[PDB]
Amino acid sequence: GSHSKVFIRSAINRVHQNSAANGGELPRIVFPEGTSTKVLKALATLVEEKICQPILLGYPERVKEKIKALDIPLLNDVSIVHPSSHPKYFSFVEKLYSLRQRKGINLGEAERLMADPNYFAAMMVNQGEADGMVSGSSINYADAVRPILQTIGVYKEGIPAGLNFVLLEDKFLVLADTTVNLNPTAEQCAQIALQAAKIVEYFGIEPRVAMLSYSNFSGAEGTPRKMKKAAEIARSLRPDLMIEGDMQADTAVNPEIMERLFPFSGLKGGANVLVFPNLESSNIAYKLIQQIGKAEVIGPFLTGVRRSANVLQRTTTVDGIVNSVVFTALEAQYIKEVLKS
Amino acid sequence: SKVFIRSAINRVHQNSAANGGELPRIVFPEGTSTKVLKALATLVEEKICQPILLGYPERVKEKIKALDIPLLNDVSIVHPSSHPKYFSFVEKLYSLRQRKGINLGEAERLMADPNYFAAMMVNQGEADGMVSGSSINYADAVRPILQTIGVYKEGIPAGLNFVLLEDKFLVLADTTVNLNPTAEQCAQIALQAAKIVEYFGIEPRVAMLSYSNFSGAEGTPRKMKKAAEIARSLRPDLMIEGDMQADTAVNPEIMERLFPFSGLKGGANVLVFPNLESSNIAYKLIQQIGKAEVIGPFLTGVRRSANVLQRTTTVDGIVNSVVFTALEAQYIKEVLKS
Amino acid sequence: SHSKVFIRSAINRVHQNSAANGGELPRIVFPEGTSTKVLKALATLVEEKICQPILLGYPERVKEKIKALDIPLLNDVSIVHPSSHPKYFSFVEKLYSLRQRKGINLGEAERLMADPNYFAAMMVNQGEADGMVSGSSINYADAVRPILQTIGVYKEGIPAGLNFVLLEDKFLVLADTTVNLNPTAEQCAQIALQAAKIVEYFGIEPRVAMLSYSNFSGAEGTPRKMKKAAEIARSLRPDLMIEGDMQADTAVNPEIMERLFPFSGLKGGANVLVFPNLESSNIAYKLIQQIGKAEVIGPFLTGVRRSANVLQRTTTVDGIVNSVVFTALEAQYIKEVLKS
Amino acid sequence: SKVFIRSAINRVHQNSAANGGELPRIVFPEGTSTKVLKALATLVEEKICQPILLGYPERVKEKIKALDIPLLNDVSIVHPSSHPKYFSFVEKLYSLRQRKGINLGEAERLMADPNYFAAMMVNQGEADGMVSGSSINYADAVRPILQTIGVYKEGIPAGLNFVLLEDKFLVLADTTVNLNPTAEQCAQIALQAAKIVEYFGIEPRVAMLSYSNFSGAEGTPRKMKKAAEIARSLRPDLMIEGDMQADTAVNPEIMERLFPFSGLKGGANVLVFPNLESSNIAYKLIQQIGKAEVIGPFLTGVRRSANVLQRTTTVDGIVNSVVFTALEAQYIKEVLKS
Amino acid sequence: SHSKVFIRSAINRVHQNSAANGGELPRIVFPEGTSTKVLKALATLVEEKICQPILLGYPERVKEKIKALDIPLLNDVSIVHPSSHPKYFSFVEKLYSLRQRKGINLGEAERLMADPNYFAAMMVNQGEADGMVSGSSINYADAVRPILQTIGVYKEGIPAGLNFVLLEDKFLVLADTTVNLNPTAEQCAQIALQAAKIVEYFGIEPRVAMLSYSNFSGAEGTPRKMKKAAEIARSLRPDLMIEGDMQADTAVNPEIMERLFPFSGLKGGANVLVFPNLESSNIAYKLIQQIGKAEVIGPFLTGVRRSANVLQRTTTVDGIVNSVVFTALEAQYIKEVLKS
Amino acid sequence: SKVFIRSAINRVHQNSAANGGELPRIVFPEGTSTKVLKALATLVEEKICQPILLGYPERVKEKIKALDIPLLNDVSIVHPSSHPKYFSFVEKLYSLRQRKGINLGEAERLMADPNYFAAMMVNQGEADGMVSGSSINYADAVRPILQTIGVYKEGIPAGLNFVLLEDKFLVLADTTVNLNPTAEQCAQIALQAAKIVEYFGIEPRVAMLSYSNFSGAEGTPRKMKKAAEIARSLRPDLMIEGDMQADTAVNPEIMERLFPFSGLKGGANVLVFPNLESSNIAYKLIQQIGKAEVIGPFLTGVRRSANVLQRTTTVDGIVNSVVFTALEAQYIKEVLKS
């Protein structure tokens, strides 16, 4: 809908200007599930929009049958690759073996693993054969994110964490971590908050962070103390930022409540970054907002990884996949423009 | 949206009419709270309850004059220390809590507090229900209720909110009390939620929520799965399922496409949460971001009608709460017919 | 002198029990046969008709030290050397049968039965003796260990040390002052019950308080534990006054009790104080002993199937006679209930 | 036994004259307690302190005339909410606990409690000390003191009792506050008790109590041994020994006969306990069946002089306690000019 | 050697079982239809009429590698590719039914069933084959998992790996050497029973030792666990000699047993060794294999409803043959239990 | 096989010849044991040590002269209670354990027990070594040794066995002492074993054993990987690898085929076990079913040479044990010239 339509549009244009400012180059983005119906319709929409050069994984023949089966003339010159047959396959196996030979994985096992398109996608982005990847529209979340974590890994002091946008009529809220960590520590919560914060900063918005709890500034043993400590750590790391907690969710989003009941709070003007204390709360919240709050909700997107990779959920729509790939492109460009410095 | 409240108001009238026209006596510890009083104006125009206010009679009349609402004069006003049943109440609280760290002086001082006094009023039949906690935090407001009124058999104190959608309403629990309920506690919460939904002539369809879809893995997935099983064994006629993600629960299309083995068909109308972080955070986020109205929380599992507001409540929230307290009070009066 | 009046009544009951049982005196074996102090005690008691003592050690060594402190009334006393007693191998055989699956081999067992403590124990267990008194030479844990291993507890019983505080008219009973680090609610109830039976033996109504640092709070930890212990004790003997959790001054002082906690079922001051942990019991009884004017006797071991007592390593000679007296009484009481 | 009390009283007079004849202001939240007023009768006639009574002015004047006590007709009596610094006091408390669950309404209503008000008065220098808790249980009374006045640096709040023997005096700690103190905490307590004993020109000799004589075994014995080692390393001039049984500690003859290696000769005069059950049971049993008079408990480790009585306290117990509260207030004021 | 005799006996007993069952051979499926070692094994196995092998993979790849390794006797052998088989979707539906509440949806079930291990498993489960051998190609946990998810355990049974140590005279059986990290007393008892029932099949008296670092100590930890395990085992099978806790030399050397522990119900030396945890069983069998002169066969999977074994990938061709032999033998046993 | 043992004997002869003809003094607490006396019979004709027997002098001559031997009347015999340095020994033991539950009488009684006496003989330089425990179980026998002689700096008591093959020898540890050694502790055991292996002129190659090959998974895999890393960081000159299975550790062909990245080439000759079950069961199983002779256990990590047998030992085992005990005694005596 409407708010979603303007948001994505600004993003599509920035990928246009970032490609137009690096010689017109498009980010190379690999899709392990080359035969997915949903993914292919999405790519159809995506290629006329000049955002990425897609790379598809699977048997060349089987996917060409399925794209023709799905009536799409705009998608025939795109690279299609079967991992075992790619020329860089064995260097990739040796690399994975090198990475996990002391983590229960032997050489044969590395070969078997690298044959799975997820691992191959990850190794492609990791070795620079692709700029980014989108995976997991058919497999469950944990299993899809695992190769990304083993192969691409996190940036220094970073923590893998899923992030969603709920798009309101002027502003947007960001929610994390919605997919990865069961029960993040105070330290992990602070880090999750900082990652969410940089994402908000990309969009030119001042980040205002709340560490969520079932309590309003109580600091009692358990989740309240944990979110209070998390805000204290985040603040020690970024003294320029409005970061506050522990607080209830309405206290966080509604500044009128804040200023009336807790005026001492350093969080003024309503939070636009919401950090959850555990996975039950984040997962349940973003999904409920999506289904009954009737507010537009995009994501989840993966934060904390060194190269751009995002895993879809199985319930994702086709335009949802387009959103995900757009942001994968933006992230890839962001990273490559940051590695030039 | 407005339809639901107005309907309930009609039911208060229909029940009161079927009982000789008396309205449920509802006590308010916060007698000088602005919100409680003007909301009370709006509800008192509607013949929903006979309000009893606690405080100094004179401070309450001064602040009644201050908010220019003549329509609630002549309503009963009581100062706890000066009520004739005061010493008897103190004696009661004492016998209840003398082996729980409380001496007679402590009992006296506690019964002077409007919350304890209200609680005891409801417990002794001096009132039918109470609405408190627009000024103090939930734990502190709910505590005298748990100590005085208590739970019914095998019951569990649990907060429940309604999400009122376009045709449907969803019920959410436990949104206020239990930090990390067990499987067993979750089943009980489900059962309580279910009875509430049944009151409204709707068949309960229950979801035990998790971050997972039917995995049964160690931790929350297994706990909510086991909860579903326990609920089914205590009441086999019910549509109760889990572990499942929230969208899987509320969206029948997702259910039908991705998990057709599920004994839950048609979208859930009861969502039981795995812990207080998720339940509290969710209902408050929905109330603030979704168009849908959220009423509550209402305290389930207690022997008499008692409800704690959230401190962040608007006045419409308070009139809504008082309405559903009234209904609850007459439902209870009707279950006490046995 | 409360100690002398108190012991004197006891001595009269051992005398009363010995009559009507053919005039027979309980046989009590003493593992430290070469100890100066034990012998000093035996001198005083053979003059008092309380038991027929059996001493363990080498006959030559024992007559040596009996000759050294000039005591003629204990010549003609039963003296036994463990390896040379005739039932020795039958004994080693039973200990072996008892502990073959609890780390003990036949040789190890052999050497253990050679230890005076284990043999004294096995003697009482096989009915070749009626009671024992041990550990005037060895440490407490180390002395009680063979007793628990050979003699054991009676049904539902729990090993527990008990002291008497003798005041100007009544006495207080304190337990458990020696054995259990951190008794559960259940165990505290059993401790209470055993103490109570002792008090009942003296014709006094037992009045039991489960001690805590709290007055009826039932809060998490020891308060809830002692409240629950009293509820258990009350369920097991509903005729008895048993109450808790409460503070010690609340416990012993009835005026304090009635002024502050009239709902309490304990009226008249406690005469049995059951403690929540070993620190409280041990420290209390020893302090009462050292700064309190009042005399404190014990500790005596309760809960065992046959009459056994462990002394302290620091114990005096009168400590040994009152200990042996109580041991005789215990042996007689048991033999008389085993009568139908 | 009363000899010790007289020595203390005379010192109160001596310090009082060395500061212009000025008396320590000590506030008593229980302004209407018969016990406190009778004890204050004895104290004002003894020139030990300037009393501050908390409550409604007229009700306590009513009860001082009602209980026939003419020597405190003119004493300062204060009702908290009507005090001129009431709102600034609410602001400091609010500021202190806004992130520990307390909102401004809760701050106001708390500051109304005489306990909280006594503590804030001493905190802000409006009074020099306070004695409370003859009517409420210990935890509830000591809490505002810990929240408002707090501990001094590296300090640990702990109750200390004096055993007055016919000869020496013994000190017992921690007799009221901490359930199961660690080695480090036991050491700290030993040092605080030690400084108290030094105040009286006495060499403190410290014993860490246990059920064991120098075993150091897993549990309480190791803890009391390690606590003695810690104490010895933190203050090498003091005789501090453990683990040991109590009779070993107080009887020097047993010490020389059985453990001549101990660095403690001459019998202990500072007894530090392994847990709250042992300290509480012990001092109370000694007080009730022991022939020695026991005073306290006194709270150590706090920045300003504040002491909580025991509920079982006698009136002579209160006069004793307040005498030593005065001495403490003076020591604290004389060290604060540095 | 010892291996050659034992294997010949197993083979002759497979032949003896094929009689009275119509000359029918156990149907055994090999998901790794293209494994060199397995095909090499299958030559030897089919000349010996041990099983009717079913190969999984592409018909053309497997016939190509059959031709490439010159084995003429495996042309016409059943070869099935999971995806093109007629009961494929029915198999997917069954797996979906088994794991829909354990995190697997219909699509995940489809993909899993596409894997030869899962398809093999489901064949055994559905009676379209009698047994399976996998994992000469993948590491152990991954290979054993589909078997447990599809085939499962029998009543009160436990997945457990078992090895034979073949000596110059006797054989010892070792378990559990592959699956369970730290089995309980109860689980150890079950493991012992499974090892025993196997020993019984060969007409041998099972004599079982619960191994520990201790001799009949029953102390906290693994000693108490192995003694308790032995007690549970005895209570379920009183005709059997089962003893513990004991040290290994005590267990296998009857002269030691009789000299130091005559009370022990284990006389004549153990031939079943049940280990307290996976470190000890796994390290034990590998050290025996590598430094003793003793031959070691296995591991074999016990506790499963139908006949399935996983090789280790480090397996030799003769190893695959042993595995298939004992798998066939097991299959026949199980079919003999379905005879009432 | 026999060659390794004869080589040890040949070296004890070489040091015994090269330091003036001195034979290492070795004490035996069980002076009346048949097994020990038969071993002593084989050993005294081999000039490896000066034996001292413990028990009643006349009783040990009763059983030794009586059963098959003419070469044992020339031997040292000691009854603890009658030895001239007895009371001095109890005095040092008292000093060592006075704060560990043992008082002077208990010190006397322990020192009358031959095990404590033997250890104290070695500790005071009055003897060079001891061999004990064919009559008592292992723990009870090793305790006086640990309480008296103790560990060297950063050392940890650990039993070590040799498996003797036709070319190599392997060491297995810790086979006797620690239930579930930590990563740090395992590294330490590795280091002590490596030191013994260097002594025999072989380069140590250490493998940390697991049920897994380089998985590093939660539990034992991670523990042994971590142990190998710590050990390498303390001794970078050593080949140390893990976590790995036993065939992977001992068989170098397996290593190069399956795990070519490993820093361990040539097969491990030092095997460190993850727990007491695996170590004890392993060495006993190899001992009973493999052709190979297994000697030990020998107690490592302790300051002076002391060793405990298991009863399951044969006489030839006692022969071997006393042999490396004498040799050990000579090595430690050579560190004592510094």
Which positions in chain F touch C139 (Cβ < 8 Å)?
101, 103, 106
Nearest to A109 among E103, E107, E139 (CB): E139
Contact B135 D105 (CB under 8 A): yes
E-chain residue closest to C108, CA distance: E260
Minimal-distance CA residue of chain A relative to B289: A293
Query: d(Cα B304, Cα B306) in Å, to the nearest integer?
Result: 6
**Three-class SS state of F134:** coil
User: With left for phi above 0 and alpha for psi between -120 and 50, is residue B76 left, alpha or beta?
Assistant: beta
Phi, psi angles (nearest 5°) of residue F113: -70, 120
Taking the CB of residue F208, how many other CB atoms lie within 10 A of it? 32
Inter-chain CB proximity D215 and F101 less than 8 Å: yes
Sort residue E71 into left (φ over 0), alpha (ψ -120 to 50) or beta: beta
First to last CA, chain D: 35
CA distance C294 to chain D (A): 7
Q: Would an 8 Å CB–CB cutoff place A255 in contact with chain D? A: no
Q: How many CB atoms lie within 10 A of CB D95?
A: 11
- CA distance linking residue B328 with residue D171, whole number of Å: 60
Residues 6+ apart with CB under 8 A from E192: E175, E208, E210, E229, E230, E233, E242, E272, E274
Of C108, C138, C139, the CB nearest to F136: C108
| Cα–Cα distance measured from residue E217 to residue C53, given in angstroms and rounded to the nearest whole number | 36
* A266 vs D: CB within 8 A: no
Burial of C51 (0-12, 13-18, 19+ CB in 10 A): buried
**Residue D200, exposed/middle/buried by CB under 10 A (0-12, 13-18, 19+)?**
middle
Rounded CA-CA distance D327/D335 in Å is: 12
Q: How far is CA F234 from CA F175, F180, F184, F228, in A?
A: 23, 21, 11, 10
Which ranges of chain E does DSSP label H, i.e. alpha helix?
A: 2-18, 36-46, 59-68, 88-99, 106-114, 116-126, 140-150, 185-201, 222-236, 248-252, 254-260, 278-291, 317-337
Chain A interface includes D105 (CB < 8 A):
no
Mutation target to probe the A interface, by most A beta carbons within 10 A, among E35, E105, E112 is E105
Q: Would you call A284 and B288 a contact, using CB atoms and an 8 Å cutoff?
A: no
> Rg (Cα) of chain D, in Å, rounded?
21
Q: CB within 8 A of C11, min separation 6: which ones? A: C48, C50, C325
Contact residues, chain C, for D170 at CB < 8 Å: 291
Which C-chain residues 164-223 have CB contacts (< 8 A) with chain B? Answer: 214, 216-219
Residues across chain A: 341
Determine whether the interchain pair F137/C105 forms a contact, defined as Cβ–Cβ distance below 8 Å.
Answer: yes
| Residues B70, A296: Cα–Cα separation, whole Å | 46
- Token pair for residue A258? 């804040």
Segment A4-12 long-range contacts (CB within 8 Å, at least 24 positions apart): A4/A167, A4/A296, A4/A298, A4/A323, A7/A165, A7/A167, A7/A172, A7/A298, A8/A322, A8/A323, A8/A326, A11/A326, A11/A327, A11/A330, A12/A49, A12/A51, A12/A326
Q: How far apart are CA B321 and CA F301, in angstroms?
A: 74
Closest C-alpha to B172, from B149, B193, B195? B193
Helices (H) and strands (E) in chain F, counts: 13, 11
- Measure the CA–CA gap between F226 and F291, rounded to whole angstroms: 34
Structural Rg of chain F based on CA atoms = 21
Give the closest of A215, A219, A261 to D103, CB-based: A261
Measured CA distances, B259 to A291, D22, D329, E96, E328 (Å): 18, 83, 73, 11, 39
Experimental method reported for this structure: X-ray
Which of A93, A97, A102 to mutate: most F Cβ within 10 Å? A102
Antiparallel, parallel or unpaired: β A161-167 and A172-176? antiparallel
Look at residues D330, D18, D298, D95 and name the one whose alpha carbon lies nearest to residue D177. Answer: D298
From the list D92, D116, D161, D140, the residue with the least C-alpha distance to D299 is: D161
Q: Could you tell me which residues come within 8 angstroms of residue A253 by beta carbon, excluding any fewer than 6 positions away?
A: A173, A210, A270, A271, A274, B285, B288, B289
The string of DSSP letters for F158-226 reads EEEEEEE-SS-EEEEE-SSS-SS--HHHHHHHHHHHHHHHHHTT---EEEEE-SSSS---TTHHHHHHH
Work out whether strand A79-81 and strand A172-176 pair parallel, antiparallel, or are unpaired: unpaired
Q: Which of C222, C250, C289 sits opposite D247 (nearest CB)?
A: C289
* F261 vs A: CB within 8 A: yes
Cβ–Cβ of A138/E107 closer than 8 Å? yes
**F68 near E CB under 8 A:** no
Interface-testing mutation among B208, B214, B245, with chain E (most E C-beta atoms within 10 A): B214
**Mutation for testing the B interface, residue in D106, D134, D310, D311 having most B CBs under 10 Å:** D106
Q: What is the token pair recorded at E142?
A: 């991954």
The kind and range of the H/E element at F242 are: strand F239-244
Measure A164 CA to nearest chain D CA, in Å.
29
Q: Is D73 annotated as a binding residue?
A: no
Q: How far is CA E138 from CA A24, A284, E311, F248, in A?
A: 46, 38, 9, 18
Helices A117-126 and A141-151: crossing angle in degrees, nearest 10, is 30
Crossing angle of helices C140-150 and C88-99, in 10° steps, is 90
Q: Give pairs for C148-153: CB < 8 Å, separation 24+.
A: C148/C304, C149/C98, C149/C99, C149/C118, C149/C121, C150/C95, C150/C98, C150/C118, C150/C121, C150/C122, C150/C124, C150/C125, C151/C121, C151/C124, C151/C125, C151/C304, C151/C305, C151/C306, C151/C308, C152/C304, C152/C305, C153/C303, C153/C304, C153/C305
D226 Cβ under 8 Å from any chain F Cβ: no
Chain E partners within 8 Å of B259 (Cβ): 100, 105
Q: Which residues of F touch D215 (CB under 8 A)?
A: 100-101
- Cis status of the peptide bond prior to F167, with omega within 30 of 0: no
Q: Do chains D and C touch (3 or more CB pairs under 8 A)?
A: yes
Q: What is the dihedral of CA C162, C165, C166, C167, to 10 degrees?
A: -150
With CA atoms as reference, the chain A residue closest to B250 would be A291
Contacts of B305 (CB under 8 A, 6+ apart): B24, B26, B122, B128, B129, B130, B325, B328, B329, B332
Question: Residue with structure tokens 């079967």?
Answer: A82
**CA B54 – CA B75 distance, rounded (Å):** 11
Nearest residue of F to residue D258, measured between CA atoms? F103
